[PDB]
Amino acid sequence: GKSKKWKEILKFPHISQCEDLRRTIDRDYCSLCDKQPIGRLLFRQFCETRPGLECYIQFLDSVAEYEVTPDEKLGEKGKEIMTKYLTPKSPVFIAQVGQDLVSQTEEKLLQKPCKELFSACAQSVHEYLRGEPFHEYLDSMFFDRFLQWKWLERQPVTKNTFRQYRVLGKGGFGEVCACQVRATGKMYACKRLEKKRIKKRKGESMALNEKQILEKVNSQFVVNLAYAYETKDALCLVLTIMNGGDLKFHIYNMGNPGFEEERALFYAAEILCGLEDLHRENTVYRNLKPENILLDDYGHIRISDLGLAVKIPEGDLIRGRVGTVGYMAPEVLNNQRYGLSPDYWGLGCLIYEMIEGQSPFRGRKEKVKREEVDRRVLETEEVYSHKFSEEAKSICKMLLTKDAKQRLGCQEEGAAEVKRHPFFRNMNFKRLEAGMLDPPFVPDPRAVYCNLDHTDDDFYSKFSTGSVSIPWQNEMIETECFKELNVFGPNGTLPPDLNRNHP
């Protein structure tokens, strides 16, 4: 559903328009060739043109497949990689890996195989590409092309860039619509924040805090920010669309109430990965409850309402009694200094509630007051049933440890301690992070699962920062706008837009 003249809109600028970009973009190999989706492709495409580099991309691709290969098929895929890339007479032989590293990874295969057999060689490969190949790509026409894509990425974003459809959701500070990018046709969900309502309630720094947190995290399991623009009477956050419902609905309306343990395992594993990505930015979510875990078209889940999220200064704690009754960790209820520990308590609440069909401190058929619900969270030991395996009972009561110091995942190890818990003994997190595990429930597509101050002007410029880099480049790729516009001259020659002779 791209606009009729979308090639006019995403028309590349002439390379001469990008000289300011060429001298302001930092030339970090990991950023330009890996983190940024379109840079990664363009650099990979540069190595396709060279005979020697070609084989280093193919090899890294086969190591990626090795990491997510099933355990009982490792020895099979490992030998294949060895005999194809690490044999002296191979036509696609890897040379920069010293023979003291090809004969070393021979021994790993002479014994049991691990998922990281080729981690030693993959870094050796990357260390080579960082140097001579990367600096050649900088002086190649593929980096000029990257500068053209960046020039587009930075173009201003306004109401016309989008196309609002239906008001799908409401709440506080505004409503949530469903929009579409006219030029690419990709769907998002606007979070229209009414302008007059923010100044009145005096929550400007809270609206920025959420926008900053959303754009800084890029996770498969948290809603991502793709655009932030201002308009008349509102500020807009363009977020990942979640059309599959929310976990609360599936627990109580589609559930028994509740899920099978294996089904709750899948959602728990994805939620745990979401929290881990947030904690990589020392950001605590503080708002874990089932109605905030949303499902998508394919049945995967993302954490949603980041309105109560805050970035902890490293080495420092925060105070704040905030959340929803029944999902506040004991240290939050007491209004103490805490860090990331509330999110692991919230994870305990979620695994328990998914499995049992009710909250661990309030019966589904129980009428109790906020005071009793809070007393239980601070003084009562939750009980379990035959719906829980011993492994499930363990992780839940370890995560529901009242004392945040002895609570699972609240150590220096972090989320790694949780992924190692026997409750995930049968879960492969590499394959889960790669989207290779079929969700337990796939939503049906057609389904419906349910004033003139200047201080206000300065507050907008910090918020309305335009498009977000990684999501924008991923949009251009999903919609095949990249595949379509990224064209060069016939037989590896310069197209006109990259030739400084005739503009």
Ligand X SMILES: Cc1[nH]c(/C=C2\C(=O)Nc3ccc(C(=O)N[C@H](C)c4ccc(F)cc4)cc32)c(C)c1NC(=O)[C@@H]1CCC(=O)O1
Binding residues for ligand X, per CB under 6 A?
Answer: 168-171, 173-176, 178, 189, 191-193, 223, 239-243, 245, 294, 304-305, 307, 448-450
Q: How far is the CB of 436 from ligand X (least distance, A)?
A: 24
Q: At 246, phi and psi to the nearest 5?
A: -135, 155
Q: How far is the CB of 304 from ligand X (least distance, A)?
A: 4
Q: Which is nearer to ligand X, 179 or 418 (CB)?
A: 179
| Minimum distance, C-beta of residue 153 to ligand X, in the bound complex (Å) | 22
Least gap, CB of 208 to ligand X (angstroms): 14
Q: Are 395 and 423 a contacting pair, CB within 8 Å?
A: yes
Least distance to ligand X from the beta carbon of 469, Å?
20
Tell the burial category of 55 from Cβ atoms under 10 Å away from its Cβ (0-12, 13-18, 19+): buried
Q: How far apart are CA 273 and CA 295, in angstroms?
A: 15
**292 CB-side CA count, 13 A:** 24
Task: Give the residue with the Cβ less far from ligand X, 96 or 180.
Answer: 180
Nearest to 216, CA basis, from 299, 280, 148: 280
Nearer to ligand X, 172 or 422 (CB): 172
Which residue lies nearer to ligand X by CB, 223 or 351? 223
Q: In terms of CB distance, is 306 or 415 closer to ligand X? A: 306
Give buried/exposed letters for 14-31 (b at 16+ CB in 10 A, else e): bbeebeebeeebeeebee
Q: Which residue is nearest to ligand X (CB)?
A: 174
CB of 169 to ligand X, least distance (A): 4
- With CA atoms as reference, report the closest residue to 266 among 298, 236, 291, 288: 298
SS3 237: strand
- Which residue's structure tokens are 């956050």? 237
* DSSP states along 64-76: HHHHTS-GGGHHH
Taking the complex as a whole, how short is the minimal distance between the CB of residue 406 and ligand X, in angstroms? Answer: 32
Closer CB to ligand X, 134 or 327, in the complex:
327
- Of 283 and 304, CB closest to ligand X: 304
